[PDB]
Design a protein around this ligand. Structure first.
Ligand SMILES: O=C(O)CNC(=O)C(=O)O
Ligand SMILES: [Mn+2]
Length: 429
């Protein structure tokens, strides 16, 4: 049902369909040559240059090389400079250009294309919404906000605009205000609203205002295929891995690592405390977004399977000890770090980025009261010299209401059911 032919193109249809059918066939290099060999025959053929662009685009995905895709991007541009272009074609051409620009990471370039599209089609609400995304991708939330306010002023019930507007409000720390927009947008069922990210932000927003209803939406998100479960909501996952919030050492199979940590715990403690005393600067503040209040800092020895040399100079014995255990030092999706938390601290409920790791906590300095950690429905406490093990892809939450500082040692390990080849293959997080 789209009109892709000006007065010109209608005359040469039998040829255009030929070159097109070639592409549909998958015999690409020819459709290219075909399409290439039609502009010289007739330069002012939008449907010809557009065709060429598609081939280049199609070819980009086959060759999987960004240089050819860059070619397509300009060819799409060329379509829009021709004398008489069908509205549908012009729109298709530039929209696709913008999308590919975003794919390459040319965010401001995509934005410029979207700005052009919006002035070319002032009445297309779909394109205004896309422009808003353009602004978001360069971090210009203020202009994005203006865009979605325009849309909503004309189309009060556009779901796409609502979830994005809600997102923007939440990013501006207007948490409570963001929730109705996120809800209504998702409930609209409009194209682009069935996105895990909006379930994430909606749930997060509700939890930060104490609305227990958040779990209803996490459950819905799970049923929509956005989360592994109501509790397990990590983004980068491997299917088939045993999924439970709390693990015993025996269940993990990493009994020797655990034994080594527990048996040498005073040593691990003392080197961490020595850094605190003599080089407190190496303890960096933890994720500000996860901290409601209080004081919370970390000192990393390993990150994504990479040893931090300067840090291991501060805790040489501890690093020497860990070298023996590649299941953690080689875990490219985990870390090894000291974590200190002071009284009056609360960490928002949250989830890790992957189900490919388990997280061990060795207690080093644990006040007799006030410190606890919940993972899923079970809350537990640390013990000095003892290891806790949980799957941090499950929602967990932390409190520190003691009268003195709490120090733990965090050791990530590969999920034990991951194969050697999997461990070798997975990219880092
Ligand atoms: O240091 C703490 O108490 C908080 N730790 C976590 O949330 C974690 O290990 O994933
Ligand atoms: Mn955590």
């Amino acid at each position: 049902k789209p009109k892709l032919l000006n007065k010109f193109d209608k005359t040469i249809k039998a040829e255009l369909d030929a070159a097109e059918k070639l592409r549909k066939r998958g015999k690409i290099e020819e459709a290219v040559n075909a399409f290439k060999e039609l502009v010289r025959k007739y330069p002012q053929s939008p449907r010809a240059r557009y065709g060429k662009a598609q081939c280049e685009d199609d070819l980009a995905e086959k060759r999987r090389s960004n240089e050819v895709l860059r070619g397509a991007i300009e060819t799409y541009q060329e379509v829009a400079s021709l004398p008489d272009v069908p509205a549908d074609l012009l729109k298709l051409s530039l929209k696709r250009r913008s999308d590919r620009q975003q794919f390459l990471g040319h965010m401001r370039g995509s934005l410029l294309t979207l700005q052009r599209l919006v002035q070319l089609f002032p009445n297309d609400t779909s394109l205004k919404n896309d422009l808003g995304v353009g602004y978001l991708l360069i971090g210009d939330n203020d202009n994005a906000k203006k865009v979605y306010e325009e849309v909503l002023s004309v189309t009060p019930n556009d779901g796409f605009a609502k979830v994005h507007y809600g997102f923007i409000l939440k990013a501006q720390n207007k948490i409570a205000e963001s929730i109705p927009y996120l809800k209504e947008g998702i409930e609209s069922g409009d194209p682009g609203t069935d996105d895990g990210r909006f379930y994430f932000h909606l749930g997060d927003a509700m939890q930060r205002v104490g609305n227990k209803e958040a779990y209803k939406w996490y459950e819905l998100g799970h049923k929509r295929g956005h989360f592994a479960s109501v509790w397990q909501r990590s983004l980068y996952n491997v299917n088939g891995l045993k999924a439970q919030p709390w693990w015993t050492p025996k269940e993990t199979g990493y009994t020797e690592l655990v034994k080594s940590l527990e048996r040498n715990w005073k040593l691990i403690r003392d080197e961490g405390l020595a850094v605190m005393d003599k080089a407190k600067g190496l303890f960096l503040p933890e994720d500000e977004n996860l901290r409601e209040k209080g004081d919370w800092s970390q000192f990393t020895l390993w990150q994504q399977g990479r040893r931090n040399e300067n840090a291991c100079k501060g805790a040489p014995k501890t690093c020497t000890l860990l070298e023996k255990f590649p299941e953690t030092t080689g875990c490219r999706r985990g870390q090894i770090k000291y974590s200190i938390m002071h009284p009056g601290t609360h960490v928002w409920p949250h989830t890790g980025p992957t189900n490919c790791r388990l997280r061990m906590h060795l207690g080093l300095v644990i006040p007799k009261e006030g410190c606890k950690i919940r993972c899923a429905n079970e809350t537990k406490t640390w013990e000095e010299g003892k290891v806790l093990i949980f799957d941090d892809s499950f929602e967990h939450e932390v409190w520190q209401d003691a009268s003195s500082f709490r120090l733990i040692f965090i050791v990530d390990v590969w999920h034990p059911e991951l194969t050697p080849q999997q461990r070798r293959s997975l990219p880092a997080i």
